[PDB]
């Protein structure tokens, strides 16, 4: 639902790159160039950022249980 | 339900010996070293160091089961030598090699950070 | 039936071996005397197999014939293959 | 019958990785060093969580697992701390553990990013790597107005054999014989394969001529750090840990030999 | 089909008189498989006297006790002398060949198609090979086996 | 749940007693996927094992007398062959002739019948794999294979 | 001495049927002193052999220069004088077949000894006079050296 | 060669003569056999019922063995002949073609309890009640139902203690 | 002679081992041997 | 969805059904595994009469 912390394969930290990745994408980067800007050179970490679906943004459309 | 704790690969159970030496009766001057809570990391280096000893006739290791956490190292030496002595010398040589490698890596790091 | 002429095989069948070993192992487990010597065996099955190899199981196999008669063979009288 | 005399040559040293070469050592020694980089170099990581309040959309184990994987600077503290197995204290103490606290509440209308910057420690030396004084902070959870996350973590000493969260590496590239001279690989079509970065061959030549008398020497390493330890600290701690494994093994060996 | 077959044959069993009988004690087979042998121990073999011609059968199975030098190559000196001199032995070998020829005709009426592949208990060629290797038989030297000993 | 039933199963239904089936007088279990592809690759003619590799493999022989066999190649460098190690795996002194699946049908007629160019024509003698590439035909569930002859 | 056969051979062909294995090559050779054909499987990876080469082949029952049997077991820590010191390529195998042109009545004029060096096959065929040392299921050594 | 005419030449070799054979789509074995220039010795059929009606119980035994073997081996498989022989003897040991069905298996004198195990449980037990049939408990099904040791394998004999050998 | 005598003994022992054992449920065994291959052969 | 932890099951003298005093059916009922007709036929072919009696008499509903 949320960006993983580490790459499943190598263990590189990708948790701090989702927001930067999105900011680069709205900056008219291609996904490949964006992944290059964040330093994801192994295709495992590129897999992590490139195949992520941010479902938490949809789960935050529901009001919480307590106000 | 059946997951062993992850520390069981590294930690010795109470009353369990780290290493056990058993005489191999098939051939003379051979021993089996059953080392608990170790894996290929030490087995491979100990075996390969023992292969550098010309007085060692056989040096092999196996992890009998990956789900279990022991290794067995079989060492056969020449009659004038001993498998226990060979194993001891192999560990001593590995320790000296790693000490030298550590000191040289410290020197290389110092050179790289300095210039 | 004339015991002087028994027509059945002189070999112990696999089923005879199985049941004789199981029976004797139960007898040993129920504190029956052992007929062979023992080094350190405590499993009744091992003791029963040792007794069978030694040919010292005190059991008689009563093999029934289709006509209704029977033939009694001592476990020591049969040829143990396996 | 005696030890190798390995030499070392570091070809790159940054804060992110160390690229070096070990020569005149056995392949087993090189691979055990490589394995210890991953599995027997201790670091500090969150291994105990107490959720006092979690109104977020991720359940408690999700947050706990996520906190465990945040790297914590472990450089000089990991050698000093003890394993909780070895500590003579109760569940915790400052000699075997580091206390973290996290307390965030989304009161404002925009989504609140609970990041690793919100992990407040009692020890200034052991902090989240991203929080160390660029790279953004690791995201623990996004909160909506009215959602709240309050927890209390304890970080422990461990290595990658127990859990990958105690693995300090973000990839260990290991290579040897870049030109296939030992023929430990057999390419069906050697021309089809790209050249290693460490290759020394002219482009017409696909692989080196076969070396019948050759042995694996000159192992190339690129140890990338997740952040907890410096890459050179990972390598030094790996060598020290392997040497102490061998020393303990020799001690137990001596007790077994003399007891016989 | 499996259930039907099982319920039809479930109680058929080999009895201690070696007959195969059902629960009613009726006789289904006087010997199991017509040969009283279990199916685990049997194996594929070849009948060597089925396919060959009369000339080839004669040449391969008729012991030739007239060729002195051939016997000298195959057998040792005392065996050669006994085989060439004695006529009782020669008659024994002649009747051996006649018995094999009768067996040949019996096989020819059993297997009207020339298929020598048969399933039999003991793999005699493999046992012969085992004996050759266990006792280090030299195929190039004359043997000390009397053909009368083979027949008997 | 009893010694009698335990003895029954141990003497009748144990898997080694179940290797050959009465259905078709052949083995019911044989060597299977990875072990079969690998034994085919292992018994090829150009498989040469080094001293350390050979000792590694001999660690996994339960029925090993502890004697390292004399390597098939002594010089310029000691090398054992895959057939030389499978010979140690093969039990007893069994004798077996088979043919690898790629055995050409016109090879048993011409010359080279007993020295096969393709290393087909499996020949095991006295429990040593004298020659040939092992495969389904030699280690599978068919009749007359090495596993059958071993049983 | 322990030598069953010795001669100088000349590589007349390599892999007539084509390369079957990558690291192994079949040599069809003929000598001059005895007129014996040879088929030999050699590991060309470690001991390459080119067409037209000329080598000395020595089938021996033992490696020790003095008559002394071998145990068939690998003893690398052996300091005795071995005749493998005088050769480049050495293999160790067993004779698994001896054919001939014998008849039911005549002995063999030509023999054909087959040896297997752990799967690397050799056939040495020629006059039966030169192959009396060969007996089936007997261990031998190759002892082969290249010469100019 | 399975349909060719295999003869033995005067020299003693097996020779496969390549001859014309006819395959019909129906069966009148009774009539076709009695036709001029038709071989009344090798002409056969795959309809085992007609073989039983024309040639008899042993002829249908052999033919049924042949047809089952053809069904089993057509896919290259192989089954030990004793299994086919036992199945074919079961279907022919009572002089008629005993189908492997309730109409052939529950019509023999196997005992009501064995029959109820297979099929027609209620009809079989009701027939046995109406006729006072007695099951002698000879088969394995009957003993299995009563929880007794089946006379099968390890149950086909008795064990006695040897008093003279316990010494 | 030694090889032939050993061969005779081996043939005798293996033949006596191939004899069917009283108590073999050859009927159930045959039903299984004929029904197991039936599960592989084609329906159409 | 098929995780082993939702499938692993064992029994040793658990609850029994009311009508026939045999083990229950299912993991959820702590039931026993069915020793069916085909298992009976297999063990008849094996010749294991005491094991067959144990499974069909003594381990089910004595
Ligand atoms: Zn990665
Ligand atoms: Zn503490």
UniProtKB/TrEMBL annotation, chain B:
Domain of life of the source: Eukaryota
GO biological process: transcription by RNA polymerase II
Keyword Transcription part of the UniProt annotation: yes
GO CC, alphabetical: RNA polymerase II, core complex
Primary site of residence: nucleus
Tagged with keyword Transcription: yes
Keywords on record: DNA-directed RNA polymerase, Nucleus, Transcription
Cited Gene3D superfamilies: RNA polymerase, RBP11-like subunit (3.30.1360.10)
DNA-directed RNA polymerase RBP11-like dimerisation domain residues: 31-103
GO molecular function: DNA binding; DNA-directed RNA polymerase activity; protein dimerization activity
Subcellular location: Nucleus
Pfam family, one: RNA_pol_L_2
UniProt record similarity statement: Belongs to the archaeal Rpo11/eukaryotic RPB11/RPC19 RNA polymerase subunit family.
Name listed for the protein in its UniProt record: DNA-directed RNA polymerase II subunit RPB11-a
Organism expressing this protein natively: Sus scrofa
TrEMBL record, chain C:
GO cellular component assignments: fibrillar center; RNA polymerase I complex; RNA polymerase II, core complex; RNA polymerase III complex
Keywords carried by this UniProt record: DNA-directed RNA polymerase, Nucleus, Transcription
Protein location: Nucleus
Protein's GO biological process: transcription by RNA polymerase I; transcription by RNA polymerase II; tRNA transcription by RNA polymerase III
Major subcellular site: nucleus
GO molecular function: DNA binding; DNA-directed RNA polymerase activity
Entry function: DNA-dependent RNA polymerase catalyzes the transcription of DNA into RNA using the four ribonucleoside triphosphates as substrates. Common component of RNA polymerases I, II, and III which synthesize ribosomal RNA precursors, mRNA precursors and many functional non-coding RNAs, and small RNAs, such as 5S rRNA and tRNAs, respectively. Pol II is the central component of the basal RNA polymerase II transcription machinery. Pols are composed of mobile elements that move relative to each other.
Family that this chain belongs to: Belongs to the archaeal Rpo6/eukaryotic RPB6 RNA polymerase subunit family.
Name of protein: DNA-directed RNA polymerases I, II, and III subunit RPABC2
Species in which this protein is naturally found: Sus scrofa (Pig)
Gene from which this protein is expressed: POLR2F
Residues of the full protein shown: 46 to 127 of 127
TrEMBL record, chain G:
UniProt source species: Sus scrofa
Main location: nucleus
Name of the protein in question: DNA-directed RNA polymerases I, II, and III subunit RPABC3
Role of this protein: DNA-dependent RNA polymerase catalyzes the transcription of DNA into RNA using the four ribonucleoside triphosphates as substrates. Common component of RNA polymerases I, II and III which synthesize ribosomal RNA precursors, mRNA precursors and many functional non-coding RNAs, and small RNAs, such as 5S rRNA and tRNAs, respectively.
PANTHER family in UniProt: DNA-DIRECTED RNA POLYMERASES I, II, AND III SUBUNIT RPABC3
Taxonomy, superkingdom: Eukaryota
MF (Gene Ontology): DNA-directed RNA polymerase activity
Gene Ontology CC annotations of this record: RNA polymerase I complex; RNA polymerase II, core complex; RNA polymerase III complex
Subcellular location: Nucleus
GO BP terms: DNA-templated transcription
Family in the record: Belongs to the eukaryotic RPB8 RNA polymerase subunit family.
InterPro entries cross-referenced by the UniProt entry: NA-bd_OB-fold, RPABC3
Keywords: DNA-directed RNA polymerase, Nucleus, Transcription
From TrEMBL, chain J:
Membrane-spanning segments: none
Location of this chain's protein in the cell: Nucleus
Function (record text): RNA-dependent RNA polymerase that catalyzes the extension of a non-coding RNA (ncRNA) at the 3'-end using the four ribonucleoside triphosphates as substrates. An internal ncRNA sequence near the 3'-end serves as a template in a single-round Pol II-mediated RNA polymerization reaction. May decrease the stability of ncRNAs that repress Pol II-mediated gene transcription.
Sequence similarity: Belongs to the RNA polymerase beta chain family.
Name of this protein: DNA-directed RNA polymerase subunit beta
Species of provenance: Sus scrofa
Parent sequence residues shown: 1178 to 1239 of 1300
């Amino acid at each position: 639902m949320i960006i993983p912390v580490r790459c499943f394969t190598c263990g590189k930290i990708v948790g701090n790159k989702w927001e930067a990745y999105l900011g680069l994408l709205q900056a008219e980067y291609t996904e490949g160039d964006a992944l290059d800007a964040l330093g994801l050179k192994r295709y495992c970490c590129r897999r992590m950022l490139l195949a992520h679906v941010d479902l938490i943004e949809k789960l935050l459309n529901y009001a919480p249980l307590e106000k | 339900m059946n997951a062993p704790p992850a520390f069981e690969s590294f930690l010795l159970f109470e009353g369990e010996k780290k290493i056990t030496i058993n005489k191999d009766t098939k051939v003379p001057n051979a021993c089996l070293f059953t080392i608990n809570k170790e894996d290929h990391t030490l087995g491979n280096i100990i075996k390969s160091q023992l292969l550098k000893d010309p007085q060692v006739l056989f040096a092999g290791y196996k992890v009998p089961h990956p789900l279990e956490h022991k290794i067995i190292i079989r060492v056969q030496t020449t009659p004038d030598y001993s498998p226990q002595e060979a194993f001891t010398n192999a560990i001593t040589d590995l320790i000296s090699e790693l000490s030298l490698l550590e000191e040289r890596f410290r020197v290389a790091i110092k050179d790289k950070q300095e210039g | 039936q004339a015991n002087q002429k028994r027509i059945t095989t002189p070999y112990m069948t696999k089923y005879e071996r199985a049941r004789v070993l199981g029976t004797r192992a139960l007898q040993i487990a129920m504190c029956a005397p052992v007929m062979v010597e023992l080094e350190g065996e405590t499993d009744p099955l091992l003791i029963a197999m040792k007794e069978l190899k030694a040919r010292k199981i005190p059991i008689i196999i009563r093999r029934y014939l289709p006509d209704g008669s029977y033939e009694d063979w001592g476990v020591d009288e049969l040829i143990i293959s396996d | 019958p005696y030890a190798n005399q390995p030499t070392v040559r570091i070809t790159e040293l940054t804060d992110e990785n160390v690229k070096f070469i070990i020569e005149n050592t056995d392949l087993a020694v090189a691979n055990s060093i490589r394995r210890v980089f991953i599995a027997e170099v201790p670091i500090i990581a969150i291994d105990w969580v107490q959720i006092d309040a979690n109104s977020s959309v991720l359940h408690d184990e999700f947050i706990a697992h996520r906190l465990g994987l945040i790297p914590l600077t472990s450089d000089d503290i990991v050698d000093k701390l003890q394993y909780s197995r070895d500590c003579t204290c109760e569940e915790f103490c400052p000699e075997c553990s580091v206390e973290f606290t996290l307390d965030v509440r989304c009161n404002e209308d925009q989504t609140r990013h609970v990041t690793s910057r919100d992990l407040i420690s009692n020890s200034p030396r052991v902090i989240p790597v991203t929080s160390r004084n660029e790279q953004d902070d690791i995201l623990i959870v996004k909160l909506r107005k009215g959602q709240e996350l309050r927890l209390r973590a304890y970080a422990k000493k461990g290595f990658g054999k127990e859990h990958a969260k105690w693995n300090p590496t973000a990839g260990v590239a290991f290579e040897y014989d870049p030109d296939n001279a030992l023929r430990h690989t057999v390419y069906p079509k050697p021309e089809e394969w790209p050249k290693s970065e460490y290759s020394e061959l002219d482009e017409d030549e696909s692989q080196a001529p076969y070396d019948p008398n050759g042995k694996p020497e000159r192992f190339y390493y690129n140890v990338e750090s997740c952040g907890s330890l410096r890459p050179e600290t990972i390598v030094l701690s790996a060598l020290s840990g392997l040497k102490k494994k061998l020393s303990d093994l020799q001690t137990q060996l001596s007790h077994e030999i003399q007891s016989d | 089909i499996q259930r039907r077959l099982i319920k039809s044959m479930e109680s058929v069993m080999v009895k201690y008189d070696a007959t195969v009988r059902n629960s009613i004690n009726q006789v289904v087979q006087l010997r199991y498989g017509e040969d009283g042998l279990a199916g685990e121990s049997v194996e594929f073999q070849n009948l060597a006297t089925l396919k060959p011609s009369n000339k080839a059968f004669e040449k391969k199975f008729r012991f030739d006790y007239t060729n002195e030098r051939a016997l000298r190559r195959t057998l040792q000196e005392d065996l050669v002398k006994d085989v060439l001199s004695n006529a009782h032995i020669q008659n024994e070998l002649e009747r051996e060949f006649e018995r094999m020829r009768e067996d040949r005709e019996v096989l020819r009426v059993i297997f009207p198609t020339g298929d020598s592949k048969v399933v039999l208990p003991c793999n005699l060629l493999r046992m012969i090979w085992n004996a050759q290797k266990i006792f280090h038989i030299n195929p190039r030297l004359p043997s000390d086996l009397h053909p009368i000993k083979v027949v008997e | 749940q009893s010694l009698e039933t335990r003895a029954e199963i141990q003497e009748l239904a144990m898997v080694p007693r179940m290797i050959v089936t009465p259905q078709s007088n052949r083995p019911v279990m044989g060597i299977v996927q990875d072990t079969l592809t690998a034994v085919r690759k292992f018994t090829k003619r150009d498989v040469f094992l080094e001293r350390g590799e050979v000792m590694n493999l001999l660690m996994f022989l339960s029925t090993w007398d502890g004697k390292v066999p004399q390597p098939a190649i002594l010089k310029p460098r000691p090398l054992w062959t895959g057939k030389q190690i499978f010979s140690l795996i093969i039990p007893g002194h069994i004798n077996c002739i088979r043919t690898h699946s790629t055995h050409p049908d016109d090879e048993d007629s011409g010359p080279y019948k007993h020295i096969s160019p393709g290393d087909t024509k499996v020949v095991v003698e006295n429990g040593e794999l004298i020659m040939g590439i092992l495969c389904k035909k030699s280690l599978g569930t068919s009749a007359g294979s090495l596993v059958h002859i071993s049983y | 001495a322990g030598i069953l056969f010795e001669d100088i051979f000349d590589v007349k062909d390599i892999d007539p049927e084509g390369k079957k294995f990558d690291r192994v090559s079949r040599l069809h050779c003929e000598s001059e002193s005895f007129k014996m054909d040879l088929i030999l499987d050699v590991n060309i990876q470690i001991y390459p052999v080119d067409l037209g080469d000329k080598f000395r082949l020595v089938i021996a029952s033992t490696l020790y220069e003095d008559g002394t049997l071998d145990d068939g077991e690998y003893n690398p820590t052996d300091d005795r004088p071995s005749r493998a010191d005088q050769f480049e390529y050495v293999m160790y195998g067993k004779v698994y077949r001896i054919e001939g042109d014998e008849t039911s009545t005549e002995a063999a004029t030509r023999l054909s000894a087959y040896v297997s060096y752990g799967g690397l096959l050799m056939r040495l065929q020629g006059d039966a006079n030169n192959l009396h040392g060969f007996e089936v299921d007997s261990r031998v050594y190759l002892l082969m050296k290249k010469l100019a | 060669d399975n349909k060719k005419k295999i003869i033995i030449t005067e020299d003693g070799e097996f020779k496969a003569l390549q001859e014309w054979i006819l395959e019909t789509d129906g069966v009148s074995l009774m009539r076709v056999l009695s036709e001029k220039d038709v071989d009344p010795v090798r002409t056969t059929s795959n309809d085992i019922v007609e073989i039983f009606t024309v040639l008899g119980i042993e002829a249908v035994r052999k033919a049924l063995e042949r047809e089952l073997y053809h069904v089993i081996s057509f896919d290259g498989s192989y089954v030990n002949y004793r299994h086919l022989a036992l199945l074919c003897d079961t279907m022919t040991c009572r002089g008629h073609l005993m189908a492997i069905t309730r109409h052939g298996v529950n019509r023999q004198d196997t005992g009501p309890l064995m029959k109820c195990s297979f099929e027609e449980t209620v009809d079989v037990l009701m027939e046995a009640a109406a006729h006072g049939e007695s099951d002698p408990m000879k088969g394995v099904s009957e003993n299995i139902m009563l929880g007794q040791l089946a006379p099968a394998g390890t149950g086909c004999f008795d064990l006695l203690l040897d008093a003279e050998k316990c010494k | 002679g030694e090889a032939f005598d050993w061969l005779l003994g081996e043939i005798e022992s293996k033949f006596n081992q191939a004899i069917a054992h009283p108590g073999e449920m050859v009927g159930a065994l045959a039903a299984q041997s004929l029904g197991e291959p039936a599960t592989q052969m084609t329906l159409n | 969805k098929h995780m082993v932890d939702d499938k692993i099951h064992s029994r040793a003298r658990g609850p029994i059904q009311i009508l026939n005093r045999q083990p229950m059916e299912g993991r959820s009922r702590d039931g026993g595994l069915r020793f069916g007709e085909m298992e009976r036929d297999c063990q008849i072919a094996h010749g294991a009469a005491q094991f067959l009696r144990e499974r069909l008499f003594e381990a089910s509903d004595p």
